[model samples]
Target: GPRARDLGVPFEGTPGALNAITDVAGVEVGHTTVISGDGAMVIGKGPYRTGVTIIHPLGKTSLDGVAAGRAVINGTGEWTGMHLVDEVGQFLGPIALTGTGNVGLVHQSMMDWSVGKVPEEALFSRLLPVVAETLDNRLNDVFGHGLTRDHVFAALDGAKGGPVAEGNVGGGTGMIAYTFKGGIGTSSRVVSAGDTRYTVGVLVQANHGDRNDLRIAGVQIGKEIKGAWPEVNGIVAAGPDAGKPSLLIVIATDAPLMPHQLERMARRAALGVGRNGSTAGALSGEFALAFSTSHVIPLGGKPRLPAIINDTDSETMNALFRGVVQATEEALVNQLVASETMTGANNAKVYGIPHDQLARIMKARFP
Candidate 1:
């Protein structure tokens, strides 16, 4: 799949070494794309356009946990155990994303995996697995039991820290964004403060926005590139809720920050979401989670929250905020650029943004 820059799409921000969440050192990501059957949807089987995606904040060491923050832009969606992140100001285990109805199953499967990883940890270890979701019934037979424990296990076993795969993969398999085929996308930025450098990486399951409202590089192309519609089988796209899409983002950084600072970073990403032309509409479930691997006390008493300041060489705090906006904006574009036109269950079709048309329109506008 082609990325935004690969298609000559312009964006602002200095990316990290790998331009992925793994650029934050120990971060790891993995996916299991479950595509089964075709034609019509069978409640008990087939046409499964869904899977699991896992984010390991400190790779497999996420069990050790890290400082984490959460932001709920809109409450129309569900993210299991997010309250724990807010209440305790920390994250434990892997973060998983999947179809809306599959959240419970995946969340349970994650617990099973965690238990299996450490048989003794089950002896009184409190575990509340983190799982988020976006509706994908438009493509997948979400009501079916296609997402089993095997799929979740596959994702976790395959997790690795490096370049991540994006677009039409993992939990985003059946997602639609801006009325186009949208799924997974990721990007990163490195900021400096004094003599210390920090890596902030963002990964998103892109499935929000109306086609007519998508904006790229400050250019209005959605109104120009029109005329594509795919029915969600025979059902309306969630009745009145169709217009209110949802998005889930996981932002990881190696910056030394406390839960309070991490919350600011999480909130900053919301601006980037709006920049791409989607807000937390009444029905939209837009949320973000931010975490830092640095400044974590190995032998700790009370956690420390560092002030993002460029006392010596760092961009201090504000520049990092801008990085969140820039990376998020670009990552959303990457989702559009990489995904291909996909037809889901019941003849429901979603188109990929035509690169040729986009290029032609952009040259005229940018020139």
Candidate 2:
């Protein structure tokens, strides 16, 4: 499928080799899509449209914790282990994202698998796994609990480093963004500081926003399209719980930095969200967590090596801040572009953005 840039929608910054969060060394991502049944809804049975995504900060086999920090923009939804990240500023295990109700199972799955592979010291250090969520009840059997522990395990076990799949996959399987089909998206940027070149990458599960709020490449494409077409495809008007929104993101970088710096980096994710108008605020769960792969802290004990500090005002940090905003923007665009039309529970149809219409609007407005 074509992406935003492929549609000639200009975006800022220079992308990495894979243009994904995997551009950060040792970071890996995987997904477990659970789409089964159709038609009527059953509370724990058929008509399911939900899944899970796993992120390994230091590869699939390395469960060692990394210096990490998180920021909560709205904090209206659950994000387990936020307290731990706040208290210690570190992420000790796999990071997971899923439907609002599946948080428990997915969080435990990471802890359960820690026994066979990860060192006890690393696994038990905080036992605080980062798990985030968004509601997908409109197009999913919200209470059906379609996903199980096995799916979570699959994502953790299958994590791989490289280009990641975008849209209609992973934790975004049943997600709708800007009244269009939206899901997993990722992009990365290469930042140069003196002789050192670092990568800042971003991945997003875009499940929020109203169609009228969408802003594309300095153009009011959302409003433009809103006026041009009454509705897209056969998407029915939003059904229930349409007011609440959720947008989850994970930022990965190879710059040697501490948790506080990472938190600062995470805050810039707001800039990216602003770039796309917004599904943020009062009724939304807007959260972001960031970690660095290059500065892998050894588990336990005080290291004889000096702790390198990442200067907040340095060129590296400056480039990274700019990259974070740029990468987050592109990642969301990828989500919108790569997703396809999907019809879910109760025959709730969500349509994909019409590229031809979008192109026409861009050409007429900018030309």
Candidate 3:
């Protein structure tokens, strides 16, 4: 599928070769898209449109801890085990994303995988996995059982460093953003602090936004898009009645940033969401988590202090902040571009942003 840049949508910053979260060394991503049955919803039977996404901060095989931090814009949704990340500034397992009702299953599966991979005595006294969720009931049978341990394991085991799929794959399968087809999206930026270069990459699960509030490349393209809003049970989905919106953002970098620094960097992701016209709706659940691959915390040893960027180095910090915001904005647009128009349960339907229409509008507005 084509990306925003491929369609001539202008974005700032230089992208790494893959222009993806995988561009951050030692980070890998994988998805398990579960799309089966169609039409009317079934309590626990068919018409499923949900799945799982996995991100390995130290590749798939490492049990080492990655320095991390998190910030939230709204508190209506869930990101399990964030308390640990908030306090300890790190997590020992792969990060997972899935539908709202599937967080527990995914969390359990992560713990199961963790125990099986490492000796029980060497593992943490208790494992709290990082799992997040956004509602997918609009087009999915939210109350049904669709995702399983196998699906979660597949995503975790299959994660690899390379180009990542976007739009409607994995946890983003049934999501909607700006009232259009929304799902997974990713982008990366290469930045420098003095002579040393670092890569900042972001992956987003976009499930929020109103058509009237959408923007593209600084242009209010959503309102200009006219009609074509998604419909539920034959009525157009709109306004406050369109279900609460949410966004999940995961930031990865090779920069040796400490917990406090990563917290500030995590907050920068909100700027990128704002750039795309999200007001962080009253009920929206917007969360951002950032981690650095350089500061690895040993599983069970008293480790030496990790190297970190100079605190007084404003130039480097600001560069990284810019990288986060830019990559996040681009990743959101990439999701809009890559996700296709889809219809699911109860015949509900959501449209993907029209590529040609978007290109024309962007060229005219930004030119």
Candidate 4:
């Protein structure tokens, strides 16, 4: 929750106009949040509060055949459509992030919508959408299964590019972060050498970490705010040590990098987690996916199409690594900054990062 000005850590370069992952040219983010209902879980009915998020690195441009790379840092969670990305080294549709139970429905919705926009001949084959997930059992009736195929379609249709809405929105509507009211958070950075510059952006479905482990700007805010856990609606009471958390990180960039290179960038997400005080606990299914907006390398469509890749200079690669680390760290902090305490089914209450106290502490430390 602390301001970037207070971090004291010197950032490498300037940020884009929006200072968000969307700052990457042509990249866009959209959210379809379902936040309502309470009491007993109702399948396909009330008390349901979860939705989907879509990331379009090239805006609405058809990804029918493009060179993309995907890497999974952890294997404990489900990420439908990733196999295709890994196999073909590209993604053909928009990337979707939603609750675990809604993966199948969301996958179908994205494919169907994408197919409808293209020619009938193009529709003959199936489309595998890149959809990732994070557990929401703490607030939603995940096992009861509330999300539907129609809801997923709505999210896909509603996808747009612009200033993204953070905190308790989209697939993160019912997510938890570090035992607090965690949801969605995003950040971006610009890397420049000579006259050339590249943008790196990150979006995270933050539902991980523990209380005492929470830190910001090198200050232990979690301990400061301890013993004040908010009252939840339907969550069963637990002792001090209860359920562990997990984080889902999605990294997007315009810098050209291959699949193996992208994996290296994704691995740095753990460093960002460390900044936020996570030990990569056994219960945390921490994973990251990095994609490039450059070099539209086709998968299997028309022949004779040309492809371009970024210059693979060791120095340039190092800069990308730094960009990924910085963007990831800032995104996690922004998640805490933008979140508000939420009370969901069963009166389960999750507290938000106390911004006021956070700012004050940061000011004291940095100034």
Q: Evaluated with lDDT, which candidate comes out highest?
A: 3
The candidate that wins on TM-score is 3
lDDT of 3 at 235: 74
Q: Residue-wise lDDT of candidate 2 within 142-217, one digit each (tens)?
A: 7766888889888888989877998888899999888888789999999887677789999999888877778887
The Cα error of candidate 2 at residue 60, in Å, is: 1.5
Note the clash tally of each candidate. Answer: 6, 1, 0, 13
Runs with alpha carbons beyond 4 Å of true place in candidate 4: 1-13, 42-46, 124-126, 226-228, 233-245, 298-312
Q: Which clashing pairs does model 3 show?
A: none
lDDT of 1 by residue, 1-367 (tens): 5677766677886899777778888888999998878888888676888888999877764446678888888879999878888887886678998899799899888878877785564424337888999999788898888888998998998999878999999989999998888799998888765466667899999888887678988776776664444445444353233533389988988777778778888998889988887756787788999988875533224554464433233356766777788888888888888788787777677878888777777777766
lDDT of 4 by residue, 1-367 (tens): 3334343433445666776778877776778887777666565554666788888767765644444555455577887667876776666667788888778878777777766776666664346667888887767767555776677666666666667778888888888887777788888878774356778888888988877787775667776653446554433244363442267888887776666677677777777777778777676667788888775654354422233345467567667777887888878877876778777666577777776666666667667
lDDT of 3 by residue, 127-200 (tens): 78889999998888888888889999889889888899998999999998988998999999999777878999
**Each prediction's TM-score against the native?**
0.90, 0.91, 0.95, 0.88
After aligning candidate 1 to the native by TM-score, how far in Å is the CA of 175 from where it should be?
0.3
